[PDB]
Structures are given as structure tokens and as C-alpha cells.
Amino acid sequence: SKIRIGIVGYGNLGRGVEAAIQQNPDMELVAVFTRRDPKTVAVKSNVKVLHVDDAQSYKDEIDVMILCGGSATDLPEQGPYFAQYFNTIDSFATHARIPDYFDAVNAAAEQSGKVAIISVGWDPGLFSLNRLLGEVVLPVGNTYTFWGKGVSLGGAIRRIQGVKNAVQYIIPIDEAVNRVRSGENPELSTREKHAMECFVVLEEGADPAKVEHEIKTMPNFFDEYDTTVHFISEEELKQNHMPNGGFVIRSGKKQIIEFSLNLESNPMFTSSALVAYARAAYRLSQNGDKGAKTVFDIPFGLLSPKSPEDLRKELL
């Protein structure tokens, strides 16, 4: 009996989740639920396409619903809602709002008797686990998290005269990283830890100074990080702009433990993690478990379709 998966939202993440289900023979995607009218959305797999309102009607059909919407607006509304009617997975990433979010989701999920696993993914998710592990292995110390990865632009930069193409990355600041690696235990602000790099391909004839000036006028350009604009070629952007990754460093009073992740060729980590956690949620539900869970609550064996004995044999 295939596990039954329902997907909410058909953005990049939702598409990734759909892709990842294809490598999980033990599951069947049964439906995609969309914030757009379903008729206007072309889903790649040959499966039911429904509106979000329609979901309340599909409780019997789906085992686990994977919420693939964005954290800033969709998830706060979506998580405590779908929790009322289904076992859910999500990638909620607003750290400051996690406790409030967990609580709202837990109140729904306890009342409805369903398992909801929040905040699955690289960070939160794997990185959160790294932070906890660093703490229990060096209990007196400081924790630092650094990421390097592509980030969404401010259609705005693309409407600036002379901009042919643009892509943006968050990168760790080298001076800050060194400081932490040396066991100095620095006090680092958000702004001190990472910088934005905006890579821009100019149209032939464009003035770099004007294009930069215009980019810096974009609303909220200077809000949380400092940003450098770099003008490069189309070929340069393609060749060197690449692998998302980061690292969590625990620095004792010098004792340093560093946990890292590198992703190459678009693995779609978080999408695939949602699918693995979906399996864990299904098993817990089956056991009469309920309410909100985070990665701190989920044993890793529940993630694999293999038997515990098999996991011991092959991977331990």
C-alpha cells in the first residue's frame, strides 16, 4: 500500500517535492492543491489538480499533506489551517516566529489529532540539529551559523535600464569566519556575519555607474545586509554563478567543532527532506501520535523506508 501524498503550492518547492516523490516508490502523489485557480496551472504529473479551498473535502484520500508555500505569508495562515484537517510537513523558516508558529500549529494538530512536522529543511532542519549537537558536545561555548547560497532578488532589478540579467547570493564574510575559527569567540551581528553579492550582466552600451545607482534606490536595498554589485559577463555568470552550502561552528572556552553541508548541481535538499519527513509523519500518525513536532522530536530511522534492522546492517 503506497503512502498517499498531497501537495500544497506549485512554486519551485512544490515542483521539487513532486520530483522527489518519483524517487520514492513507496509513495503516490494523489493531488496538487493550488493557491491559483487549478484550471490555470499545468502540473507535470498526471494527478488531480485542486484549489486550496477544495482540500477540506479530501481528508480520506490523503495520508500526508506537504505544505510547499513560502514562510513570510503563506505558512502562517496555511500551517495552522491544514493541521486542522491533515498530517502535515512544512519548511517554515522564520526563526523569530517559530515558537508562535509551532504553538498555533500544535493547537490545531492536537485538537484534530494529526501529526504536523514544522520547519524541516537545511536551516531550519539540519542546521538546527547541528546547533543542538554542538551544544551538547561543548556545553560551554558559542555557536555561529554561516550560509553561502543563491537568494531571491529584490522583477525589480530586471526592469532597470541596462540590466540584462541579475542573480544574488548571500556569502559569509571571511573576516568574521576567521575570527570564529580562531577561537576568539567574537560578538557578531547579523550584518557582520554575511554580505549580499548582486551579480549583474549589463546590456551592451549600459553605464555601470547608473545601473548601480538605480539598483541601490530599490526599496529596502539596505535593510539587513551590506551588498556589493558586481558586473560580469553572461558566460561568467553561468560558469561561476554555484554550490549552496554552509557550516555551523561551536567554539568552546580553544575547542572548535564545525559541521558542514555542501550541495552541488541543484539537489533540491529541502524538497526531498519534506518527502522523507512526510514518511516519518505517516508512521507516527499510524501510531496514534498527534500534535506539532520539529526535527528535534523525530528519530532518523523513521525517515527511511528500510527496516530498523536493515538500517543497522547497511548504515550504522
Ligand X SMILES: NC(=O)C1=CN([C@@H]2O[C@H](COP(=O)(O)OP(=O)(O)OC[C@H]3O[C@@H](n4cnc5c(N)ncnc54)[C@H](OP(=O)(O)O)[C@@H]3O)[C@@H](O)[C@H]2O)C=CC1
The residues that touch ligand X, with contacts defined as CB under 6 A, are 9-14, 34-36, 41, 52, 68-71, 74, 91, 93, 121-125, 152, 270
Q: Which does 149 bind (CB under 5 to 8 A by kind): ligand 7C3, ligand X, its own copies, none?
A: ligand 7C3
Q: Does 119 bind ligand 7C3 (CB under 6 A)?
A: no
Q: Which does 148 bind (CB under 5 to 8 A by kind): ligand X, its own copies, ligand 7C3, none?
A: none
User: Per-residue x/- mask for its own copies, residues 154 to 183, rule CB under 8 A?
Assistant: -----------------------------x
- For ligand 7C3, the binding residue among 35, 51, 97, 149 (CB under 6 A) is 149
Q: What is the DSSP string of 179-215?
A: HHHTT------HHHHEEEEEEEEEPTT--HHHHHHHH
Cβ proximity to its own copies: between 58 and 277 the closer is 277
Nearest to 59 by CA among 113, 20, 122: 113
Nearest to 89 by CA among 58, 67, 61, 121: 67
Q: How far apart are CA 291 and CA 54, in angstroms?
A: 23
Q: Does 122 bind ligand 7C3 (CB under 6 A)?
A: yes
Q: How far apart are CA 60 and CA 48, in angstroms?
A: 15
- For its own copies, the binding residue among 95, 158, 210, 216 (CB under 8 A) is 95
Q: Does 147 bind ligand 7C3 (CB under 6 A)?
A: yes
Q: How far apart are CA 182 and CA 254, in angstroms?
A: 8
In 3-state terms, what secondary structure has residue 94? Answer: coil
Q: Does 300 bind its own copies (CB under 8 A)?
A: yes
Q: Does 123 bind ligand 7C3 (CB under 6 A)?
A: yes
Q: In the window 166-225, what residues touch ligand 7C3 (CB under 6 A)?
A: none
**Length of the chain measured in residues:** 316
Q: What is the DSSP string of 126-149?
A: IHHHHHHHHHHHS-SEEEEEEEEE
For residue 296, the Cα-to-chain-centroid distance in whole angstroms is 16
Cβ proximity to its own copies: between 201 and 274 the closer is 274
Q: How far apart are CA 141 and CA 122, in angstroms?
A: 23
Size of the site for ligand 7C3 (CB under 6 A): 5
Cβ proximity to ligand X: between 117 and 229 the closer is 117
Handedness of CA 189, 74, 48, 293 (dihedral sign): positive
Residue with cell 493557491: 35
Q: Which residues bind its own copies (CB under 8 A)?
A: 23-24, 95, 98-99, 102, 119, 124, 126, 128-129, 131-133, 135-140, 183, 245, 247, 252, 254-267, 269, 272-273, 276, 279, 294-301, 303-304, 308-309, 311-313, 315-316
